[PDB]
RNA sequence: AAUUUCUACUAAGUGUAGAUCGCAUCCAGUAAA
DNA sequence: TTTACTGGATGCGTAAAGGACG
DNA sequence: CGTCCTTTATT
């Protein structure tokens, strides 16, 4: 009946859901005392440690081939790519060649001698201890020999290198889909750029960059692709184009650098080269860890008997002495910086700067100008390319008997004395003696002793910095420096250990890092099956309601197999899970192995059928023949009693099936069952005691006994795993893991409210200001204990019978929709998100700004103001990292936000049975603070799509249409990005012109171009105005004008309006910069203060008339400020406001601002509002598309809208 | 201010609301020094 | 160059045949 | 030799 109500069981997807894992009896003190968990542990490290010397074997495999080959059809392929046009005779021709090229690579790698056991035990066992000759490294790769399973995953990893396919992870799609492009993009560049290039440049590049073996020519002609297959082959490549430095540190310049450098020259922009991407698999301060480090480095580096101190007492000696010196050879460095030191020395800020320019203006500025503009140019800019200032240039500012060489002498000194007094303050820090009473990140009070000091020297080094003075300069006296480098060259050390102690403090203080655990076990809880229970040595069971995690352990695989009891009321329930995974490998698999295709002697018409393929779709497909196929399926998994047992198949009449697929769907749909047996819980909780079963509750908040609310999501999936009502729709998966994550935290260090006290509550809104309980409240303290994590795959949907292609089912919908409504959703820099509702005429049903979310509990209201949580936390880091307090991370406050909306938008999806219309966001981010607005809004985009894949209502109940069993989906696969584009089921992406500085009651924009440009110009725009006068009546000035007499016009439909000199305008500042201009007043005014009258009349010959182009400038400035219908302030929150000089039929004028008031506004309400209502308006427009064609042409409707189609429909649908 | 985890919360108290596809790998990248 | 952090793209999400084995 | 690790099958 609704149009969601169609999106049921269309195609299935897969998610994993995560549970904590409790230790139940005396698991973990077995665990413990049997050393599992430690094992693992390592086995962790070992693991990442022996697959880099697994893909150091497969590198070398990689570059062996990669070196020897030499692809064949490479000029015929460059031919055909290299075509103006391209007709079908070779697009067909060329992507063979195409999809040939790289066959050629994989089948490179195919036939090197080692491909058969690059994935399997062999590889493990023999060949790559052999590959290495170190003992210790052969010894790392053996203690795996038990355990080659366990590299199954990143086998299969590695196979993707060797595929042909075209997959970003295939070796042969790097260099046929990738780098064979810019290579022959670079090819077409440097036929066209050859010209600018001298000739010792491409010599230089001949010897300093290509060995004086190849011409640069050489890697622009086609059959030196090959040289550039391998990383090494590609380093040289990228050289040629990018440069690189030789050793000694001079720099060779690229092709690309002499591209820019002609670029600059000659005015025009040439095109540049792309560089190569890398080879897969190419090997192409680190910062304190432990407290302790931290702790040491601070105390050894910093102490009084350490060189920095050293370095303080020697520099401070220097600036005693500082009249031994020559006041002509010491210099102070020129940077902003400079003001700090002329307020210590003279006493305020500009002493230094005001003094150079009364002596530099002196006899540089000359007489008659006095002080012209021009000098603040360049008295301005000469300041800042003088490098230095000599001490003796200081001394001339000064008078008598200021010495600024004692001034210096005193600063430092001051200086010095304040770092020794900090160093009391700190000097319990340095203590042998001294233990960290609480962990570093935690403890506040000790990182606030360190920063004190490394404060204090960061003061006096930055200041010291000051008088190196950059030169290279003429006569410095060496004398000075001398002593001076080694001082400062020293004290620069500070420099790491002040970034490398503040990066540990302001770490986050929690991990999750987390190892695997495999309880000995290579394959362990691989699967769910009853017939491997055994082999993977896990399973699930339950006691009532709460669920367990049972492990076997190594020397018990069986302990759990004859366990009965005949009441339930005492005991466990073990389940009894079976599955027949994947039809089309397992039933050739079983039939045709060794061990049974003797048993049911396949027909040699079958043996034949099956290699040939005549049962798939093709050229060779024989429908019979398929049948044929099914039937021997079908006899043979009867008389297969671990299938034909656990499944009672009933398949439809083999006549019936059009492929193999149907057949193979209903084995799919069908193999697989859950249930459960009972178990005695004495004969199992023993088990559990003598440490030969480990049992784990599976648990989040939702199993508590002190839970009452709604569930989560995820806990609603586990649980419906095993409900009767739950016919296939959730499939428990295979594939789990269990994690150990271990402590990052103590309680103890934990920020706690205390018991009994009463605790603030944080929404005002509330008239119950406090909470006080009776137990702790603990920050964090999910990571104060050790924990294990259980990641549970499920398989959503596994057998979709509502199968259609989305897009296509929408648009039909759409089309026999009487009144569709549509949800706009617009970016704004204002407005974080806005939401406008329209139904099926363009009736704004609803409009608010997302800014904050507003929730409902029980009576409770709350708004959460999630735009002003932003910027607090975006500047935080900028700002706080100054505080040194832990770093704040802003991507969640910002997935927080999205998932507040995300609800909210599926909410009116399914409220108004609502397509989305989403805005098209520029690829370009311009300042400033730019992922604020579009990440937001990039995040929600992904985040909307993914929800929309599997759409669930944790009210309904679970069966029903909506239920987290019939969830809707009304998008598709997020297998790409790009695959989709204008329309993914109920989303449409609609390009934002004109959507927003558009007048919603008449559909006028501003097509005009008013900047002012030059004094004739100016009475070519007045003249193409039909008429300008004045309208007493109104006190209004009319602009009669038909666009068809100014350039660029076209898009707009209606062409004639009559503009008028309407309402207030917002102008801006480009050197408050804003102030805000009434335009009946800058009319009037102006042509009082040019001698025009206004009152007669047509008045456009009397402008053209004025002689003064002051009166050209300042009325372009008002026929630009009257155009701007959208007013707003860069920063501006408060006025957002709307407003057009066009009236409409009714001869009414629009403010957003007579709308912003008023409750349920028929129209937008600010210009944020009118953006989201025109990008729904404009779906709107495709609806009317859809209901204009044909359902079989729907397919292949344009829904990307014109600006001309647009503003013929904003101007007509009134 | 608690969590499988994230965000916002705390109405009679070990929690509430919404969200949450993991693992492994490859590859593009952006910020800092 | 190095460190960190984030973006999309690939694979797996398995019971059973096959084999080694001390 | 029955236990345990490895390898297989591909709409
Ligand atoms: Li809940
Ligand atoms: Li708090």
């Not at 249930?675 to 599976?698: C, R």
């Not at 097509?1007 to 100016?1018: E, F, N, P, R, V």
Request: with cysteine; net charge neutral.
């Amino acid at each position: 009946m609704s149009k969601l109500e169609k999106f049921t069981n269309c195609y299935s997807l897969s998610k994993t859901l995560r549970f904590k894992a409790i230790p139940v009896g005396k698991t973990q003190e077995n665990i413990d005392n049997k050393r599992l968990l430690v094992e693992d542990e390592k086995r962790a490290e070992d693991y990442k440690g022996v697959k880099k010397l697994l893909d150091r074997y497969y590198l070398s495999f990689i570059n062996d081939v990669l070196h020897s080959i030499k692809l064949k059809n490479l000029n015929n392929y460059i031919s055909l790519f290299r075509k103006k046009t391209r007709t079908e005779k070779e697009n067909k021709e060329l992507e063979n060649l195409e999809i040939n090229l790289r066959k050629e690579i994989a089948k490179a790698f195919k036939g090197n001698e080692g491909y058969k056991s690059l994935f399997k035990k062999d590889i493990i066992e023999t060949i790559l201890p052999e590959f290495l000759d170190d003992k210790d490294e052969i010894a790392l790769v053996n203690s795996f020999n038990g355990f080659t399973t366990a590299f199954t995953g990143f086998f299969d990893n590695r196979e993707n290198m060797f595929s042909e396919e075209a997959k970003s992870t295939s070796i042969a799609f790097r260099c046929i889909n990738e780098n064979l492009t810019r290579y022959i993009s670079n090819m077409d560049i440097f036929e066209k750029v050859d010209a600018i290039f001298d000739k010792h440049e491409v010599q230089e590049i001949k010897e300093k960059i290509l060995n004086s073996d190849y011409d640069v020519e050489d890697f622009f002609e086609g059959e030196f692709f090959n040289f550039v297959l391998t990383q090494e082959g590609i380093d040289v490549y990228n050289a040629i184009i990018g440069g690189f430095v030789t050793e000694s540190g001079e720099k060779i310049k690229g092709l690309n650098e002499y591209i820019n450098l002609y670029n600059q020259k000659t005015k025009q922009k040439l095109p540049k080269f792309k560089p190569l991407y890398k080879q897969v698999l190419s090997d192409r301060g680190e910062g304190y860890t432990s407290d302790e480090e931290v702790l040491e480095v601070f105390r050894n580096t910093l102490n009084k008997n350490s060189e920095i101190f050293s370095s303080i007492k020697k520099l401070e000696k220097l600036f005693k002495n500082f009249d031994e010196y020559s006041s002509a050879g010491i210099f102070v460095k020129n940077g902003p910086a400079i003001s700090t030191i002329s307020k210590d020395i003279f006493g305020e800020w500009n002493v230094i700067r005001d003094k150079w320019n009364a002596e530099y203006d002196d006899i540089h500025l000359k007489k008659k100008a006095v002080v012209t503009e021009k000098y603040e140019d360049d008295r301005r800019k000469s300041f800042k390319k003088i490098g230095s200032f000599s001490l003796e240039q200081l001394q001339e500012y000064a008078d008598a008997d200021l010495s600024v060489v004692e001034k210096l002498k005193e600063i430092i000194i001051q200086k010095v004395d304040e770092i020794y007094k900090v160093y009391g303050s700190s000097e319990k820090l340095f203590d042998a003696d001294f233990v960290l009473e609480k962990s570093l990140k935690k403890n506040d009070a000790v990182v606030a002793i360190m920063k004190d000091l490394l404060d204090s020297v960061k003061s006096f080094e930055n200041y010291i910095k000051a008088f190196f003075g950059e030169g290279k300069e003429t006569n410095r006296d060496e004398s000075f420096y001398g002593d001076f480098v080694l001082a400062y060259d020293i004290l620069l050390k500070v420099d790491h250990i002040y970034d490398a102690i503040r990066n540990y403090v302001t770490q986050k203080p929690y991990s999750k890092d987390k190892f695997k655990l495999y309880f000995q076990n290579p394959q362990f809880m691989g699967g769910w099956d009853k017939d491997k229970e055994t082999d993977y040595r896990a399973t699930i069971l339950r006691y009532g309601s709460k669920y367990y995690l049972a492990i076997m352990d190594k020397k018990y695989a069986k302990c759990l197999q004859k366990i009965d009891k005949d009441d339930v009321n005492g005991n466990y329930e073990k389940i009894n899970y079976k599955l027949l995974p994947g039809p089309n490998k397992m039933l050739p698999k079983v039939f045709f192995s060794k061990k049974w295709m003797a048993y049911y002697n396949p027909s040699e018409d079958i043996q034949k059928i099956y290699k040939n393929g005549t049962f798939k779709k093709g050229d060779m497909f024989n429908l019979n023949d398929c049948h044929k196929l099914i039937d021997f399926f079908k006899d043979s998994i009867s008389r297969y009693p671990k299938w034909s047992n656990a499944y009672d198949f009933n398949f439809s009449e083999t006549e019936k099936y059009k492929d193999i697929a149907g057949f193979y769907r209903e084995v799919e749909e069908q193999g697989y069952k859950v249930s459960f047996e009972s178990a005695s819980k004495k004969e199992v909780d023993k088990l559990v005691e003598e440490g030969k079963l480990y049992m784990f509750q599976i648990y989040n908040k939702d199993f508590s006994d002190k839970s009452h609310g709604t569930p989560n999501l995820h806990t609603m999936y586990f649980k419906l795993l095993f409900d009767e009502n739950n016919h296939g729709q959730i499939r428990l998966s295979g594939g789990a893991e269990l994690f150990m994550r271990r402590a990052s935290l103590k309680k103890e260090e934990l920020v706690v409210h205390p018991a009994n006290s009463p605790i603030a509550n944080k929404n005002p809104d509330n008239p119950k200001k406090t909470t006080t309980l009776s137990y702790d409240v603990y920050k964090d303290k999910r990571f104060s204990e050790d924990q294990y994590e259980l990641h549970i795959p499920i398989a959503i949907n596994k057998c979709p019978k509502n199968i259609f292609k989305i897009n296509t089912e929408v648009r039909v919908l759409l089309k026999h929709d009487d009144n569709p409504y549509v949800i706009g959703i617009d970016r704004g820099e204002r407005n974080l998100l806005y939401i406008v509702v329209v139904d099926g005429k363009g009736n704004i049903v609803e409009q608010y700004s997302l800014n904050e979310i507003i929730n409902n509990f029980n009576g409770i209201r709350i708004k959460t103001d999630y735009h002003s949580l932003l910027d607090k936390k975006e500047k935080e880091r900028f700002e706080a990292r100054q505080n040194w307090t832990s770093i704040e991370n802003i991507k969640e406050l910002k997935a927080g936000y999205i998932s507040q909306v995300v609800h909210k938008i599926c909410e009116l999806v399914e409220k108004y049975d609502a397509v989305i219309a989403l805005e098209d966001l520029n690829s370009g981010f311009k300042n400033s603070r730019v992922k604020v607005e579009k990440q937001v809004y990039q995040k929600f985009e992904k985040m909307l799509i993914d929800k929309l894949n599997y759409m669930v209502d944790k009210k309904s109940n679970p069966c029903a249409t909506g239920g987290a069993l019939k969830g809707y989906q009304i998008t598709n696969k997020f297998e790409s990005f790009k695959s989709m584009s204008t329309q993914n089921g109920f989303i449409f992406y609609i390009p934002a012109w004109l959507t927003s500085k558009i007048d919603p009651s008449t559909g006028f924009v501003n097509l005009l171009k008013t900047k002012y440009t030059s004094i004739a110009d100016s009475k070519k725009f007045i003249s193409s105005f039909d008429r300008i006068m004045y309208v007493p009546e109104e006190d209004l000035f009319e602009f009669a004008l038909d666009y068809k007499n100014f350039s660029r016009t076209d898009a707009d439909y209606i062409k004639k309006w009559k503009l008028y000199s309407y309402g207030n305008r917002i102008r801006i500042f480009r050197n408050f910069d804003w102030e805000e201009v009434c335009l009946t007043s800058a009319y009037k005014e102006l042509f009082n203060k040019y001698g025009i009258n206004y009152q007669q009349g047509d008045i456009r010959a009397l402008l053209c008339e004025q002689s003064d182009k002051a009166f050209y400038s300042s009325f372009m400035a008002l026929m630009s400020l009257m155009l701007q219908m959208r007013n707003s302030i860069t920063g501006r929150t408060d006025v957002d406001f709307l407003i057009s000089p066009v009236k409409n039929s009714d001869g009414i004028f629009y403010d957003s601002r007579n709308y912003e008031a008023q409750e349920n506004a028929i129209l937008p309400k600010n210009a944020d509002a009118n953006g989201a209502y025109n990008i729904a308006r404009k779906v709107l427009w495709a609806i009317g598309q859809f209901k204009k064609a044909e359902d079989e042409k729907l397919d292949k409707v344009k829904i990307a809208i014109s600006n001309k189609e647009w503003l013929e429909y904003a101007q007509t649908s009134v």
